[PDB]
Amino acid sequence: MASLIYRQLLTNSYTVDLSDEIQEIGSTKEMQYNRDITIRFKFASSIVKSGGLGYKWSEISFKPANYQYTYTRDGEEVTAHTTCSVNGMNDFNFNGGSLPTDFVISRYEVIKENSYVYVDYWDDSQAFRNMVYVRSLAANLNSVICTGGDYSFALPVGQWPVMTGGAVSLHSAGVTLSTQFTDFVSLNSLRFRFRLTVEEPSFSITRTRVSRLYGLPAANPNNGKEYYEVAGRFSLISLGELREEFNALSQEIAMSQLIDLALLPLDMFSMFSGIKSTIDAAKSMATSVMKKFKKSGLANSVSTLTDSLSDAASSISRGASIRSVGSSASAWTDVSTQITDVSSSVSSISTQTSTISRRLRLKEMATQTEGMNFDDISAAVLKTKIDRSTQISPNTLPDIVTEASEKFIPNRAYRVINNDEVFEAGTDGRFFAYRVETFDEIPFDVQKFADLVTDSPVISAIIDFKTLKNLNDNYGISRQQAFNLLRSDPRVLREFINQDNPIIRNRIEQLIMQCRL
Amino acid sequence: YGINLPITGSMDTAYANSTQEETFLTSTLCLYYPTEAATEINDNSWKDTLSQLFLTKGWPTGSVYFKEYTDIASFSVDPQLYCDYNVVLMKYDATLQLDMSELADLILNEWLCNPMDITLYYYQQTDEANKWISMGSSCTIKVCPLNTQTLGIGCLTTDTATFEEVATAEKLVITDVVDGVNHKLDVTTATCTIRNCKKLGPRENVAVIQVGGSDVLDITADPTTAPQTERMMRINWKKWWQVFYTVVDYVNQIIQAMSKRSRSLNSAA
Amino acid sequence: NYGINLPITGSMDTAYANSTQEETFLTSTLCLYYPTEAATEINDNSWKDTLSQLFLTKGWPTGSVYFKEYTDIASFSVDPQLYCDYNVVLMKYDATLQLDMSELADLILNEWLCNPMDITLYYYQQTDEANKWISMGSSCTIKVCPLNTQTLGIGCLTTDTATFEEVATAEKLVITDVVDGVNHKLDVTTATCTIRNCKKLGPRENVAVIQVGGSDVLDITADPTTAPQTERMMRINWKKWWQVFYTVVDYVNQIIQAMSKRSRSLNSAAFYYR
Amino acid sequence: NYGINLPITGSMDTAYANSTQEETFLTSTLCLYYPTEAATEINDNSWKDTLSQLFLTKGWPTGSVYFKEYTDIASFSVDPQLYCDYNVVLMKYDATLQLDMSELADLILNEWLCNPMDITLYYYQQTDEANKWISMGSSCTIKVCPLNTQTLGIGCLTTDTATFEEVATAEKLVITDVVDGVNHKLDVTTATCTIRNCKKLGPRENVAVIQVGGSDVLDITADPTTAPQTERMMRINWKKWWQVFYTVVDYVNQIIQAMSKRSRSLNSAAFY
């Protein structure tokens, strides 16, 4: 369960980039409210002549244009402002020749089906001003046809060429967010963009060689109209410190109900379901949550073990001297056996065990093992509280999740059975040796340990010795059960905690209290 | 953090690897040079260029600082070592040798001082480690040894024209008198400050790097000893850009010859 | 077998083969390098000859000893085609020339490996504490410009050498050292200079720089941390030049014994050196 | 090394350690020697550069390959200093200069040991088929006078060099050979020449003289009996110089493989 969710992430990080790379290109260089809407707008043009005799034009282009107006909606007069701009315009030209007396248009813009028209809109009602958290918005608008008027090119001598025709229809396409910054204040808006379809009539330039072209030129796109209008309706659907609360919020999680929710592959789609946000948060956020992971504890560490294998299997000819408590070199055992890069205070064994725990432990998880794996107790903690909070906003979800990994279940140990011998690497401190059956302790070994750890399945000892031996005596514990209570079987464990209620309910609970972060 | 002492000696034999990777992350490096050094470099961005070069050797941008002493006398006088690790560049000026020796003796070592009132109490040094370190604008110290009666010996405790002059207008002076003898002191307190210091531990920081000559320096106040420490390095002289390149190319080597101060470590009492 | 590595049996037979000086007297050449001033002060047309007869005393056959005249530390540091088996060079303390002297010592006293550098087409970088740039000639003037990982200047424009950093102004011998592991566009005055990329190492089992005057000090470390004092680095108290030579002769073997053949040359090594 | 005393083991483990060319690409330098005419015909300010990028193809990192310009076989013969690990020298068949070329090949392609001779005070003699007198400089003119066992001339007066026997008239590189085991008073023009006594031997695991032009060979040998043909003696068919270089690049490894890396030490082959 947690197994996935966690790992599932580091698996899908490669994505982080692609997405990341988008917002750049694109980056720079509750309560519902309704309202029919009337969008009136117009284009503007810039026409620049070349110098010389006066037969040549250098540029005919679109320019943003503002419009202001008032209309009635629900018995109230609404004042609205719009700004119309275009994107993806096409550069055309006309070359009548290189003589000073030959008609030329060096560059004129035309909007076609690969172009967009944007109309920014603001009005003075109250629902509009109260839009700062937006969970969702759709518009149902009529289309409008924009047709080109004539534009005469007044040559110094003779008959004047005239650009005429051209037309496109505008269709509501995609709804976003947006905001206008003028000399002092801001005008929130979710400017829609219109996709275009070319329409009749085509355009041409009389007296020349330009006819039967489709699209709308920038020469006279308003065709003498005071404005173009698109009307319809739109519907809107609307809605350090952190830690100290997570902790307290944990002190209540049930027991049985928890465990279970650690036998359910709470993967990707699951975790970011409950969250309810304004926009593409949880989305690029499930991606940001990523763009946090690949930059933290769990990350690098795992990235290390990985190499420590390659490097030590690739080297060999020059295998690191290191050292190995066990048959032979093998990252897991040895690399920890030697790079006891920290120091002072107690006894031998414990130190390696420990350092061999670090890798072995936490680390192991994100790969292969049985029964409820620590983390799957952690995930449970998360998918829990991260729901009993309700929040939305981006800057939160990331990190906090990550950080959960690095700081959950500070310590914890593991075990490896083999011939009825529970070998328990009590991380940090301790280590014991069983006789599986009659819960007993005989000299533990750094050796027998070495290997049997390296390449065999491990177990995230839910309950360890302490709890176990104390459990075995004041109860019974059939050989049957026991054998399961080791593999950290879901069932058999769930039973007790659910049924009996003695000890077991502390070894468990205590862990919850430990994933306090 | 502090007070008491006895470590276990078992040979666990586990060296904790690297050590330069904690100093790159957590420590500051302060480079002291003379004006002439920078003037010869003649760039408005030399401090900057060297800093990027310092990332190579492993010191994060905001890590290294560049302090300009313009003379050995002022530097000797304004000693408020700013960073964790201080490596001071000294240029061989042959007339200023003792000025340099007195300054080295101060940085390279750990000092303990108390204030002296030359006006009201005639003092005496106690052991080979009790010295009088005075410094300021113009330090001029005249002394008058007292016999066991508070009477002069070769002087009249009344007229300083009979005193014995042992320093004529220095910027830093470590004065030494025959141990176990009282002396009426006559310093020019107007421009000088004289304090009674007890020496001791050597410094786990500075690293006086000497440019030029083919010196041999001389601290020990005595004649019998000559101590040569690791925090006393040398670079034959010629071009300043080269000096700095070397200091950068061997930062760790230089830092390793120093480390954590010790007298300033938190863990004290 | 002589073009590979062979390691010796360690048994303590324990039998030293006697003399050693009686093979070097017969088979080796001794080359004495001195400055002009040295000979000028001697003022005899037969000093080289007189000393040679005196050299028979110490055991060197007539045609054995040669006398080479460098007139300055700068030129000598230039055409160092050490001619004989054993070279003992006499250096007179000139205090302004110290580093000139240091750079020259660093070259003779040590074993060097070099390759040529094309300052014009490829910006280089030094690799370890043993990769240095040794340039020498008429007038060596080296300006440098450190490159970031883009081939862009750092405190300089790889385009205008007026922004470069000058690290040598007209020297006759220069061992330049830059921050290891950084590329640099170099601007030497190749007209009068030659700059080559050398890797250091083996030392010299020959020279024996004997220093006249001062209270001496030689730095051969580029770093600040180390100071190496070798046997092939001797010092004599300046009185008169005739006295210096008398001593060099009166203690030829002692001086030779502090060197010894030329491990890198000898025959049994022609492969990895020679 | 101090070692050569103890054999080496002959067991056929039989495990070839693969490639070889991947150590030389990383760690060695390649120096190309050509004549001026070669470069002049190429007429580009960036030919050295273009070829260098082309050299990355064959596997030689940018700062690896160097281009040295000899302008004549005689100068390239006088003051010798092979600069790089691997040296491949391009020689253009010039038929009048053949022996000049032979004497130069004999020097690069082989391993030389040289002691100095004092023509003034001491009349010398060569010992074996490997003791030769290699002299070189501005203008080398060597006259010789064989001595009988009395220090007396044989067909000459050790007193007047007008009776000597001229064996070299103003060459830039000369490997002189005299009847072995006979003393000779020598008369070189030491002003412009330098004559040194060399013992031959090892060969060169570097020089790969690539010959442009003609047909015909040359027998470095001084005798008449032997003719040695080595791998470090290659030949290319002339078309244009650009083509020559393209081939040298297209077959760098093949050419390098015909050499080795032992033998580089001090440049100037004569050993004083």
Coordinates of C-alpha atoms in Angstrom, one line a residue, chain D residues 6 14 43-45 78 80 98 103 108 121 131 135 140 169 203 246 259:
Chain D
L6 CA 64.3 -12.0 -12.5
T14 CA 45.4 -16.7 -22.1
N43 CA 45.7 27.5 -47.9
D44 CA 43.3 27.8 -44.9
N45 CA 43.7 29.6 -41.7
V78 CA 69.6 19.8 -37.6
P80 CA 65.7 17.6 -33.2
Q98 CA 67.3 11.3 -50.7
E103 CA 70.1 10.3 -42.6
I108 CA 64.1 9.4 -35.8
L121 CA 93.1 17.0 -28.8
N131 CA 79.3 3.1 -33.5
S135 CA 77.1 15.5 -36.9
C140 CA 78.6 20.4 -41.8
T169 CA 80.5 18.8 -48.0
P203 CA 64.6 1.5 -32.3
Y246 CA 42.5 13.1 -44.5
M259 CA 54.4 2.3 -33.1

